[PDB]
Amino acid sequence: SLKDREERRHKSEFVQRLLSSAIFD
Amino acid sequence: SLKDREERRHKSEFVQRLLSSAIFD
Amino acid sequence: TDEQISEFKEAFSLFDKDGDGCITTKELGTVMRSLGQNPTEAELQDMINEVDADGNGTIDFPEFLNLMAKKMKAFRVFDFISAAELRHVMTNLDEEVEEMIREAQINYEEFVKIM
Amino acid sequence: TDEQISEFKEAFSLFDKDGDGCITTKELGTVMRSLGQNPTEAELQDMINEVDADGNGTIDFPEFLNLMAKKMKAFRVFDFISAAELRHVMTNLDEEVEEMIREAQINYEEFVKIM
Amino acid sequence: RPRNWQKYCLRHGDFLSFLLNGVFHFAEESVIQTLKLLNLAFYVDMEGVVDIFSANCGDLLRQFIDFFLLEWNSSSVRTEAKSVIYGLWHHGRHSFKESLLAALLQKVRYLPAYGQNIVEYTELVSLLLDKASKQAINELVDRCLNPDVIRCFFETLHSQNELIANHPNSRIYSTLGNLVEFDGYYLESKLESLKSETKFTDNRIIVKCTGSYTIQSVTMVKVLNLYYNNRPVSDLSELKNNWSLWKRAKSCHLSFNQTELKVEFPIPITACNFMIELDSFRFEFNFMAKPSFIFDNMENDEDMKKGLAAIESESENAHKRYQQLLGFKKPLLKIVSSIGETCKINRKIALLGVLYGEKCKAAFDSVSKSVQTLQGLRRVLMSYLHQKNSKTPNNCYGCATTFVTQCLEILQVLSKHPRSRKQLVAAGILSELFENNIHQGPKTARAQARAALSTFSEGDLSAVNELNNLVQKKIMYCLEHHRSMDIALATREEMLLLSEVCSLTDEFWESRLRLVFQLLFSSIKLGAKHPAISEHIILPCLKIISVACTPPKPNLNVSQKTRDIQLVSYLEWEKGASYLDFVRRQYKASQSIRGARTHRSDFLALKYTLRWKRRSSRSWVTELILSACSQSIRSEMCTLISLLAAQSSPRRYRLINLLIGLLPATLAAGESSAEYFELLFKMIETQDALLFLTVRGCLTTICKLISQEVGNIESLERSLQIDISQGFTLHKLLELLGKFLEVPNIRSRFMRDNLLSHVLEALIVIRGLIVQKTKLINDCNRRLKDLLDGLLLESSENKRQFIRACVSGLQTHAEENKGRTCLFILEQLCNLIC
Amino acid sequence: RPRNWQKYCLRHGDFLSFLLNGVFHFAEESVIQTLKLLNLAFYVDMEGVVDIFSANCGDLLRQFIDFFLLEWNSSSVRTEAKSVIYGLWHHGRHSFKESLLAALLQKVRYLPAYGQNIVEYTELVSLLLDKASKQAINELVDRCLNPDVIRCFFETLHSQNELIANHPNSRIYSTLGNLVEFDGYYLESKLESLKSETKFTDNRIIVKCTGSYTIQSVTMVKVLNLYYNNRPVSDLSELKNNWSLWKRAKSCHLSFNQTELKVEFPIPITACNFMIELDSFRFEFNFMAKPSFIFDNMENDEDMKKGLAAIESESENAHKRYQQLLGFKKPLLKIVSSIGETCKINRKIALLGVLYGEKCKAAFDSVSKSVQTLQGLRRVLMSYLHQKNSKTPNNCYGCATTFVTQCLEILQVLSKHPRSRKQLVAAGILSELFENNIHQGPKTARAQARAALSTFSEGDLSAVNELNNLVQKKIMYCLEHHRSMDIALATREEMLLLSEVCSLTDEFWESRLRLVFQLLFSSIKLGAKHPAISEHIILPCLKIISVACTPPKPNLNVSQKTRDIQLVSYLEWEKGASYLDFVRRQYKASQSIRGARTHRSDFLALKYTLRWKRRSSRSWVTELILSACSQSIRSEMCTLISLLAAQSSPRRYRLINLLIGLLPATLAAGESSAEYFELLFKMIETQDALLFLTVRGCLTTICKLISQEVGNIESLERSLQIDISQGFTLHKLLELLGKFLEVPNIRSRFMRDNLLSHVLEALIVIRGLIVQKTKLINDCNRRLKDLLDGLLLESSENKRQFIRACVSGLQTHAEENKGRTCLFILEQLCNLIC
């Protein structure tokens, strides 16, 4: 569903931000 | 020496008492 | 400073491909980032519509000094800032709070030293 | 008790090999141990010299009742017994002391129940 | 025609009760015909016909179940009984459905004693208990199932797993399996081949076999008569003259000169002695049959006397064979214990192979043959004794293993039931599975066990907590003591388990991500330079994280602006920050930006509160991106860096700055920096990126790095060590410099800054090299002279500045009396002037 | 005559300085003669002669050390230099002793670069630093030694161990070593055989070899002339016609018809081309020599041109050979990773053997040959270059391993020095040794490392604490997860280490005993029924404890009475009670008993205070004494029980009571109770013990146990399982009963208590057995009838009581319509009456 796809977008973006923080902190 | 032999007697008796206590406690 | 304007001219000339003293409105973000600043794309568009009033798509050197000049250029919302005040500004949006204040009551000077 | 003397006679007869009603002075420790008691060898020799006055090396049944009779048959050295009193009777020979008293001040009755 | 048979059964229900009563006493073939008729009867509603089995308060049904689905040693009859029971379940009344499935589950306690025969029963049970007008049937299933059944399931599973684990031969089996052709557990505590004695006459052949054999057909004269008997006999003389002891099996008529005759018996004949007569007018007689221990039912006391004598003789034979088996077991145990201590082979496993596959197999087969003979004679003996006077658990490794393997699929079925799931996790099924089943058993068993564990952990809390606790503890230990054991063997199964559990899309992905991060950082901290740790722990963690970060392939201004706001940091996340906090912060920021006085104040407050949370909460990229041990890790972080930079331009620029900061470290990496340099080249493909680095003074950095590398190579000139890959890092530095010089304004800044002195000095030094002169060095020298003429061709001012640089170099090198360098620069000046 | 040479050196000291100056430039044979002369010079006091080496502020001595004890690649010359230095140390002045040993220790930082050549140097250093008029020499040794030397020792040891541990091929080497014939680490990053071209003439044979060879002698006509040259040549034509390029080595004169001629060269000749001429009047020429890379010192620039061409060609050849080595490395890595996954052999190790021992060896040898050729040509090239214009650490696994192995004996030597011991333990040498050295390296290295660790731990506190901490942690972990890895392989070295450290007779035996007790109890608690744990952890703990308890083989009333007093219990000892407390309590008790008002009160106080301490502080015998897994553990605790009972009679009686209490458990043990029953029989050998048990009602216990066992066997009668060892426990119960009955009064009590009913009933039941009728059962039946007639023969009252028992049995069995039992008892009554 569109809601599920958007939720996967948010999850991928959240884990991407986690990686960027773990690299640049 | 006699003192050393007596000390080994006491050590063996002490560890024997340890075993008997560990068995019968 | 004189060294500052000198280095800004040095960076400006490199983007000045054809030597007319003007750079394209696309390249402003790149030149401004090359000088140590990190403006967001929304700020970039704010610049582009404020300076490019005539819509020629070019920005000359005297204007190029102006955009960054304002670019390199808060206590009162949490207000001294106590633990309780920080707790309300928190809830609006205890041991950890104590750790916060201890590492930082927090006046203006400690507040500055810790930003 | 009547059952007690009956079982003592039952045990005595087994050591009575030749049926004369007397057992050897060597076997007193074995027969006395077979009945549940555990006297030390020093106690065994105390018995042997107290009962075997004539030195015949034999003990008859009526005497055999006597040795164990006294055999199946302390508060004042540590004296209620407080923590401090137990500490002096200890040093003569704190948390652990507290554990001691807690598991056991200790009157005669608790003292008995814990021996 | 199933329907006509069904109406006939309906109008004659008394016939099916007769068949059901008799089938317990029929022989196997008539048993098959009876069960086929029963199956066709329940192919029309048979509602009234089902109640036949419930006679005698269900005793008849239980006898059917026990005799048929478990006891009978034939796969086909068990499958057919399962089909019959399924038809009973489908056509039965609701009360009869409860009664029949109650008859089914009553055999749980007797299941382990029946070996592999329980497969059909368990498939039937799984199909019946599966939840699919059907609401009432599920109600019967729920009413009949009771917690006692699950408790017995768990208890027998635990008992069998304990038996396997505590087995004295478990270590021997585990070691022998990886070394030798392992196809068994033997350490558990034609006419000619069948004949033993043969006599002949003018037209008859009397044959005594080595034992009892059930023959279904005989394939090989005008009339041919076959006779048989299963009476054990000492010699053929007593049967030669007594014709009354021979039973006529079949009479066959042959055509003239018929060379082949196939004689099939409608009912198999069991015979220890057979007699073939050519009644009327080279022979090869070949029989298809099995060894049989169903001996003739003895009729007199002399026969029981002979049977008892056979008991004694076969017991002595079995004792001798068991003694030889033990005597061969001892050296096998000896060699196994020596494994791990040093024909192109290790001869120890050669001895193990001979002992285990040839002699131990033969000894165990002889022991088993004596054993089966003993059961045959004993069974017939007690049969006669009972006629005259009127399953214990085993320690078999294979039987326990197969029961465990099937019970894993049973648990996988039961795990979808919630009540059973809670009961089993409370009983501790997850710990049992993790400790024993995921490490032991065949591959199919391991997969089924992992799937069952995953299904049990789905939708239940603190199960994931305990699972991550065990995984973290054991893997972290293996990390701490990695130098003393096999990290690859110790942590392969658990790494796989963590990989599969992370793929689950329940709500508890966050905890698994936490565990992955902790494992990755711990492995980097302790064993970053260790090969096995990097290949077996760091790489799977990076792969899992990359899979999490990849978006599955299918207002914008607000979304971009919220991306500029750092919502959650890693330090906050490790301490307990949640994804729900992330989405809440993102939503509040998006609302404040959309409203962007109140929404502006909320935006500013959120900005600083999160910044101050980060401050309050307040190298691995270098270690792994240039890890000389593995190219896979370098490639993986190159992919991760590309994925991160592909989303945000400012983050891309920070990544470019970080990568450029790592340039000096590539001098030591040498060939290891191929992936990093390729990533850099992909990253700076834009001219804007090149100019961005030029503003940051990266051109001067490149120049001094080239000078440092050429000085380092010049220092290695006095050393005789020859490294073939010499100058690869210098080659890539030159390539990056050439990429920078392609832009006109960058070249103008290059010439203005008077950095041409560095390239000329490097040209001098590398042209002066002799010992360190490899192919890469020659290619670098070529590229230097190429840059030189390329610069010289552009303009006269560049030529004048190069002349000035040559003059200064001549001064400094002549003050250093360096004749060859002066010669080189004089040659260069001569070449430019003329 | 050493003495005359010594006086000649004394009167001509300027001669020895000349020899010392020249020896740096002499060739190896004259070097040997010079060092022999020097050794004989220092065979008389040479006090004034030693000061020759200290010329030029010790530069000459350091040059001697560097060139001789380290650089020269000959074991004999290094040993002779070591002897020379030892003579210098013995005959030298004190200041010269300091200077010479300072020259020695200055090469510590350069030691690792020299490979196996450091052996002689390190033996010399160990002999010199060893503490042995000698007080001043020890003073010089102490003054010269500085903490920096030990710090460098520790640092290089740590660096090499890190290199070994972090090596990418460490796992490959460890796996390949236990599978294949492992004799190297190749994964680190006659005339005909010597000839390559040959030409002949009427009387001359010109031979070009495949390379440079240093020939010491040639063994194979009236006059035979030999010529040689080491000039590299493309073809033999250029040497055929130019005689000036040939150097005459030796001229040999032959007798008539001489078939053998051995030509020895006083100085070896290095030649790439040799020419043999039969000057005046089938030939097989065989040469003893080595391949040499000392090529002729080139004299012109054409030769350096050819040398550079040879550099390029050999570099290309080496690159090709390294490429083939890598291409064969890849499949080797492939097969190694598959080890552990399932000709009588595993073919994987066959492929590994072929790859590793045959093709990888050949490829590595070819690579190395190209390498040594390259060093030869490069060395001669830079030699010519230096003439015209006027050791780095390696990652070799073998070199690092051998250096580590030698450094372990170095640490074993340094450990006897207290200051160095404290410095090294502070640096963390014990943890380093325990983590890496005790698990890795050859057996000699492991033994040396364990000895060095033991010597370091001797006489120092908290070292034993940390050692026991590591041992306890790792072994306890291996205990917890024993089902998932090899307990035997994981804990063998540490179990051995605990065994050796416990044998030390320092003051810290008490802590090691504590650790042994904790390990034993934990292993019993977790894995008592597990085979590997019992065999590899429980058994060594029991052995260590037994060794501690055994007294080494060489007032009495007071000693016996103090033995009656329990001084220290295990619960108190585990909590921190010490042996000093034990001896203090024993001494106080002995004094109080010797004085035995005050001493009586002290005795009573000690008694109750210790009793109350025990109360305040307030099964494994059963588990291990009848452990069906291992007979060794049962035998060990039987020995321990005997040792304990052999000292005290009351303790012996308590042990007898405990053993008799374990009698019912022997029913399940079966054959496992052999050791326990033998111990019991040894324990009750005295008639007093038998009567003691009789008083306790043990006869009735034996009777009811026999009844229970015969009932259990009778229940197994309906089961078809046949166990050969059936009735062994019943056999031993019968044997114990027969031992009891040997005493007359015991038999009288037996008859009086009317226990004869039990034996008659057992006789009936076992005579009625059929299925369970084994040899042990028949023997038991025999012994029953034996007891029966033995009782019957004694007296008539016994016959009357047996008749009464038969009458009661007839009543109870006739009410049970048991025909066969009634028949048996009727037969017994008939036999007694008639």
Numbering used by the authors:
A (entry chain C), B (entry chain D): 180 to 204
C (entry chain E), D (entry chain F): 6 to 78, 89 to 94, 100 to 113, 119 to 129, 136 to 146
E (entry chain A), F (entry chain B): 3091 to 3133, 3183 to 3271, 3276 to 3332, 3349 to 3379, 3390 to 3450, 3514 to 3574, 3596 to 3643, 3656 to 3819, ...
Publication passage describing the model:
Aside from teaming up with various ubiquitin ligases, UBR4 activity is linked to two specific cofactors: calcium-binding protein calmodulin (CALM1) and KCMF1 (13, 16, 17, 20, 21). The architecture of the E4 megacomplex is conserved across eukaryotes, but species-specific adaptations allow UBR4 to perform its precisely tuned quality-control function in diverse cellular environments.
We turned to Arabidopsis thaliana UBR4 (also known as BIG), which diverged from metazoan UBR4 early in eukaryotic evolution and has distinct roles in hormone signaling. Co-expression of AtUBR4, AtDI19 and AtCALM1 followed by cryo-EM analysis on the resulting complex yielded a medium resolution map of the dimerization interface, which we could model using AlphaFold3.
